[PDB]
Symmetry: D3
Amino acid sequence: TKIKVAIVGYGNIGRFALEAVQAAQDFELVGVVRRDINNVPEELQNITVTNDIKTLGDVDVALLCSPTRAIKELAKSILSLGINTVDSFDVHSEIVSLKTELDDVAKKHDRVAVISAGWDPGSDSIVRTLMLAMAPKGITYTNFGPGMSMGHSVAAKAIEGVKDALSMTIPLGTGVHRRMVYVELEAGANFNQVEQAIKADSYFSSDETHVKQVDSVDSLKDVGHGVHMTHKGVSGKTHNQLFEYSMRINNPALTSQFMVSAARASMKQRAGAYTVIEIPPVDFLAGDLNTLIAKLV
Amino acid sequence: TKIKVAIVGYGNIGRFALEAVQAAQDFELVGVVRRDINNVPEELQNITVTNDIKTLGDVDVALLCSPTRAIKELAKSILSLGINTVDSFDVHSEIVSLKTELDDVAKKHDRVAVISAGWDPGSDSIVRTLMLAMAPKGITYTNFGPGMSMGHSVAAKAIEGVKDALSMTIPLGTGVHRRMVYVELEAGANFNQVEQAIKADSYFSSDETHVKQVDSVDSLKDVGHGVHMTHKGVSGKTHNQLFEYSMRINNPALTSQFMVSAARASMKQRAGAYTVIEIPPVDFLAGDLNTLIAKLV
Amino acid sequence: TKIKVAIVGYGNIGRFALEAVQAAQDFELVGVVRRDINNVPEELQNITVTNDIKTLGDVDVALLCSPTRAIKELAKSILSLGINTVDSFDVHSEIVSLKTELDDVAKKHDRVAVISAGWDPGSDSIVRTLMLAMAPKGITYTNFGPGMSMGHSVAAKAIEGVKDALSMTIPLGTGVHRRMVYVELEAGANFNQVEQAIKADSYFSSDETHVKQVDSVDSLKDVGHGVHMTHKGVSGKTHNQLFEYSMRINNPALTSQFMVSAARASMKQRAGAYTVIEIPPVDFLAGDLNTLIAKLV
Amino acid sequence: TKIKVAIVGYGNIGRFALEAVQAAQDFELVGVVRRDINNVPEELQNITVTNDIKTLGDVDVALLCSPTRAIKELAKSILSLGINTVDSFDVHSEIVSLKTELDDVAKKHDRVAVISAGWDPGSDSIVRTLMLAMAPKGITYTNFGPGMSMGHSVAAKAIEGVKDALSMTIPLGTGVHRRMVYVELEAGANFNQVEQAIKADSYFSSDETHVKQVDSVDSLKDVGHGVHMTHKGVSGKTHNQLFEYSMRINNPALTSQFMVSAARASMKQRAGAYTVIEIPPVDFLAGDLNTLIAKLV
Amino acid sequence: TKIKVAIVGYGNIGRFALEAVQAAQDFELVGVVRRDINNVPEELQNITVTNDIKTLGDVDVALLCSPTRAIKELAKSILSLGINTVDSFDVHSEIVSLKTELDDVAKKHDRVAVISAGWDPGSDSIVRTLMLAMAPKGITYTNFGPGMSMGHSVAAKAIEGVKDALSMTIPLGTGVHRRMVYVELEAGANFNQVEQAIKADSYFSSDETHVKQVDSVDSLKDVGHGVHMTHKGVSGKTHNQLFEYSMRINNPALTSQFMVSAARASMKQRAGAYTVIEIPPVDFLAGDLNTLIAKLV
Amino acid sequence: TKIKVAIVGYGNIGRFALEAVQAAQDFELVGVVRRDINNVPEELQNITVTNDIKTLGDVDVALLCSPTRAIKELAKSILSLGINTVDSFDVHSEIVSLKTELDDVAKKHDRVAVISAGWDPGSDSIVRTLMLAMAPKGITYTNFGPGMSMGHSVAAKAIEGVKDALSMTIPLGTGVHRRMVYVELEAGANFNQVEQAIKADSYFSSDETHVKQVDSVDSLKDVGHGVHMTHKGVSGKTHNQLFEYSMRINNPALTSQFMVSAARASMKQRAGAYTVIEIPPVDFLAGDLNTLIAKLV
Ligand SMILES: N[C@H](CCC[C@H](N)C(=O)O)C(=O)O
Ligand SMILES: N[C@H](CCC[C@H](N)C(=O)O)C(=O)O
Ligand SMILES: N[C@H](CCC[C@H](N)C(=O)O)C(=O)O
Ligand SMILES: N[C@H](CCC[C@H](N)C(=O)O)C(=O)O
Ligand SMILES: N[C@H](CCC[C@H](N)C(=O)O)C(=O)O
Ligand SMILES: N[C@H](CCC[C@H](N)C(=O)O)C(=O)O
Ligand SMILES: N[C@H](CCC[C@H](N)C(=O)O)C(=O)O
Ligand SMILES: N[C@H](CCC[C@H](N)C(=O)O)C(=O)O
Ligand SMILES: N[C@H](CCC[C@H](N)C(=O)O)C(=O)O
Ligand SMILES: N[C@H](CCC[C@H](N)C(=O)O)C(=O)O
Ligand SMILES: N[C@H](CCC[C@H](N)C(=O)O)C(=O)O
Ligand SMILES: N[C@H](CCC[C@H](N)C(=O)O)C(=O)O
């Protein structure tokens, strides 16, 4: 009666998913799937590492920790082997489309896909939904950071003269963001041009962007992140109801842990694909339903 | 395609439930049930007011706004007429017991009961559940106020020499509370005895309690309330994950609005009784599932 | 010894002025004056509604709840019938000019005009004045919101292709403001042009302005507002004295309630026109002077 | 048109009153009155120092900087010479009584007495009054410190075995206070007895009191102080209106500066005694009425 | 030119010291010393583990991660082998005494001992020292938590009927602390007696103590901690200078990392024993002195 | 055993250095050096004021309170008389260069120079250094104000049409700054040109700059200042370690007091020049080493 889980892809959240699975008494790690099976860091010395999930035998659910571009085709194929999928698919504009592509397949093979089950999308999605349950009229804002931005880091690293780069994301309220960019230059490159180029780039040209040159970019890195959500609005006909939610957290630690919670929940839903706002919150937790109700409600 | 709702009982949250229903385009108020039908305040001039729900014709769901002691027997009888119930039943220790008493009846008549659907229990219950989904190990604290305490107000009002009383509830962190009590005395009563009596009473004897004498107690009343919840804990094996949620809100405004959200949700569940941590969050909301996902997730 | 009050005009603050008058035991509502007497919303079913203040008999004071452009001529005419005026006239640059136009008339007919008696101008005006009484040298800043901006909403609504609009006002400190604008477009209009047009407009071209397109603009509305005032400065020869005042409030609720307080005060001043910084604070309050001093000083 | 001021008494606030007068271009220091004229500290090397106000010639107003017990008889006698009085008389329970004793005398000699014109009573008094003007129903709390407490310091210093003592006042919210007491003992005295004696004393027996023994008590002294006031309440019929005021200030710097502002104001009132909630706020300020209105309202 | 370090003792901070050493390019881990050499957890599979430091060959410095009672005799013996010691010796009252016992020995063998180099004592010690450098007169307070208390946990665990226990430490300001205690009872023990016993115990009888019974005590544990230090005081003759320092941190992560910084610094001091307030701050850092000055000063 | 100190230069910090020296029992003020000896304000009535340090006899150390441009040549010459120097030399980019110019001279004459010993550079420098000792990897930000900016004030005052000017420095986080500029114009100057000129100037053209015209610029001046430093980073391998330090302070009061602390420390170092991150923190303090350790560590 132990939930049998495979970690597919082993990026930044990969190592943390390993820890989150190991830490859950109700889960059993049946192995790690990845492209390069010979790259075996410290923590995978004693873990089965394959490039094909079928070699791991019986698997209830797969934590997809792959790049964003890979998640769709990868989920389709693992659902098709009669295994559940959980992913942290992070592109909001495409979530509706991903859900219905995976629903077709999930239903055919009588399995469950939980999608976009990180912290945003994920956790924060539920808190945003609760805010409209409490006060349907009014405005919600979601403020991110301070934290590293992999997307914007890549966009900076991809510009003329830039050896390495790091974009930080700074909240300025009402969903507005400042971008602090730290760069190493390539032997003999013009800072002022790199600066102007980064600010003019389409990934930065909408935002207050600041660029500083540095020696080692890696020594500035910290996987700490944060959100501050607010809702101001109306319960029935009563205005100026004020709600607020904040966390200062380790990014991959949380992303991975919520995926493990989603996986637990995936085992209890009727066949199909779900966003996390379509799952009963208590389904995410381990323990006796009645002890959990006594403790939480 | 309008959800047809009756308000049963018309206490403090009664008037606010009226506003919350009227404000929801997807609801139709089919009338108000109560013991004294001749008490008809401003807002019920034009509303059907009966002492018998059967006179209202077809009703999908009933918002129970009766005293705590009445909710169980009242829900049983309205479920038995083939109507759904939503209540803000506020006694945590008895929620598990109420759920299973109402489940029996709800299932027999093929209806839904959503129970303890205020803000605590209610909203806060979901946020407490999300906190364990994000970080299962660690401590959660729920800090209440500043706000009026009806229970402790009554306990003070019921002591020798006390004409009127008001207990405020002040948060001091880690679920610890200070109680500020304001009293009018009866012609010739000894303040020092009333003070000592209130502090010694079993409703106050565990808490830092302060007593001040005043002229009009009514002029101190404000239905404003608040919560500050915190969770410090572990995502997988990563410690010192910090989560926090705060609101400054109108108490009955919110309680009533969340009951209306629960009623909306009640129409979509399989027959039985539910706490709000057993309902998909999005079921609480009005609108097209796909627009809501696009907006929230 | 009951203060006899007429509400002249019935806009947004009109309904709230009705509530503030009704709530004050020391006031008697002698009726509501307005252009269209046949528009009779819920709360005026039982209230005298005339299109001429003379039909209400003896009236001590009039709460002018008309548009900004109407206040001057309207106050002149009601003072001229031997009635006191209170208004929330909200154009700071014109307050000195309005005071002396109303002083002439108020003195001739032996009556009192209290002007600009909202929260800003109004309440905040007194706190700004107290800050110089405590520390005459140094800087004061007044930070507004988050709150709706009717002026900027109208300026946005009045641009090509815009069906409806809503400007929010966001405080960024030191009196600097961000403007968040939400718009519905008219069937086939170009977002990018409307966006650029709004940002270029004279109401927005000085401020960090952001424009988002939305479905229902009404569902974003909340009459909640707020101020954070600061003063850093010198008491005698001692520097770095720090003062701060904040509120999160229902906008029209407060505006109307302070007008009722100003009306109470108007009954105690020598004939003429006054800003609220020229009235003894205690004159705004109901009750026995000696009980109020005992309670407050 | 220069206001001619004498400083009577030269305690702690004495030196600061000197600075506040000197700093005000609209004031002329006509001298300092005191018991011992031969005690002439640094700042009074160049200032007229008499033991009798009559030697200073024509004086518009006197800043009484004497001990609390002396203010009543001292104000009576200076009013009786046809001079205005300002004091920071700090005993709230006795303000109503002091006002009417000074009113009798002030009226007889056609002069003005402003009383209890420090920061509490004083400044804070006006902000407490404004809070009821904005929201008459609800609760106000006044939280003091962290700051030195001269009254409680003296009560500690007056106990067996105590060489020197210092009581700090710590705000714990809702007007509740913690008292931190630091003591030097006399050669061979029992700490545990002194501790228990201080906690049992009538000045401390109501409050959370902590006692630490220390070497130099003087090196812990700082004249910094602070207040955090809150009001939660009702504007008309709208609940959960939230108001807040905070300052971190030099205690005597502010007390003295507000007395100088009160003195300025005293010159503009009809004969009699006033609390500061009975004076128009703008009367406290220097400058042209129309520039001040333009700047503040 | 790599600093050769041995970890002596392997408690809670032991594993974290391993990570802090490994993470420092300027250090080389020459092995781990401990009482039970056969207990070899995950991370020590490939690390030399001895019960005698002499088996590790050449060692510049030893991180003592032993119990408090062991540190003195253990430091004496390792200094005596011509190796440097760093410890987080956490008993403030005994630091002066430990320094001079280790100074004698350190000087004899021409080595360095850095003592009490955690975060308190340690980091916080330097910030407390800086506060007197900036403002020698006035008060400093050090507020701990929320965090686990091993000392108080042990004192609770050692009482009749208590299977397991956990004491949390909650800051209430001005160095005052609340203790939240969570206990498992032994089959058939009386909660009310255990509660009373814990509150009466000498480790708790001075503090606001609260006791709750729970199922699993281990699932409440989180190694997160925090400090909030304040100083209010006088720079020269200028009062009300306000300073503040806060951190929310992983306890052992920080303790261990600061010991590694102290070890780096130990290599640069003249022979003897030191508290961390006796070491130049820059000596704690790796890198070129002139680059570090350019970056920090 | 008194430290004998001369104040050389008497600018803004000059007067405050006088107070800081006088306030330190362990110091003796042997006199003040300056260019204009006939300018003798209140506090220098009784102090020896020479234009030549040699007239003061024996001097252990000199507090250089001269302009930035003078400090180098002035320190060289006073070191050369066998006297120690302390300065608040405030140009970060040139600190490394100044240290080594003064080291040469300090060593030749067997004396000590402590340089850049204000609060930034100074105090803040030590806190920035401690942050890397606690968490070497991650980002530190230093946020200044709100406070006056002498440099930017001068740059504004030096533009066409500007009679007087004041630049305030406002922190917006992540080392980003807003500049609020207040100007008096010269009889017949165009505001819009002066505004544009100030914004375009090289001292402002990188920063969010706002310009307001005013009557008296002097009445806006307050020497209050502040810093908020943050560090987010890694202790060993543990991420999201959060550190924060804030102060609200009198600028020259603090600068001068830390120079007096540096002077005390200068008496204990081997001959040479030092930044404050190269001095043992406890060397800054007066008192018995063992009492200080007992009190702080
Ligand atoms: N991996 C995270 C990334 C979302 C946060 C992103 N919006 C940012 O501001 O960095 C998640 O979706 O769970
Ligand atoms: N580094 C974080 C945030 C990604 C956000 C970044 N993709 C962007 O918003 O540009 C992550 O692993 O989710
Ligand atoms: N009827 C309220 C009770 C909230 C206040 C209560 N939890 C307390 O302050 O002790 C609700 O949950 O909707
Ligand atoms: N006024 C709130 C809270 C009452 C909370 C009650 N449990 C108490 O503490 O007395 C209500 O109407 O539910
Ligand atoms: N009508 C309001 C105006 C205040 C808010 C306005 N100053 C803003 O910028 O939002 C009043 O008289 O109270
Ligand atoms: N606040 C005002 C309208 C003006 C909004 C203010 N921001 C502006 O238009 O300048 C009101 O609610 O009547
Ligand atoms: N002497 C002060 C008293 C204020 C502080 C006092 N209320 C306290 O509890 O500290 C004044 O008149 O401004
Ligand atoms: N604050 C007053 C003294 C009284 C202190 C107050 N806490 C008390 O004694 O009750 C002062 O500085 O003159
Ligand atoms: N290991 C830590 C413990 C000190 C914190 C302790 N005072 C507490 O409140 O838990 C250290 O000295 O580095
Ligand atoms: N658990 C923490 C704190 C110890 C504090 C505890 N010993 C007490 O103050 O009772 C540590 O490992 O340092
Ligand atoms: N002279 C000051 C400069 C501080 C202010 C400056 N860092 C800025 O605000 O830009 C000091 O370090 O003592
Ligand atoms: N008023 C401060 C700060 C000047 C900072 C200067 N760097 C500038 O930004 O202009 C001082 O006297 O040092």
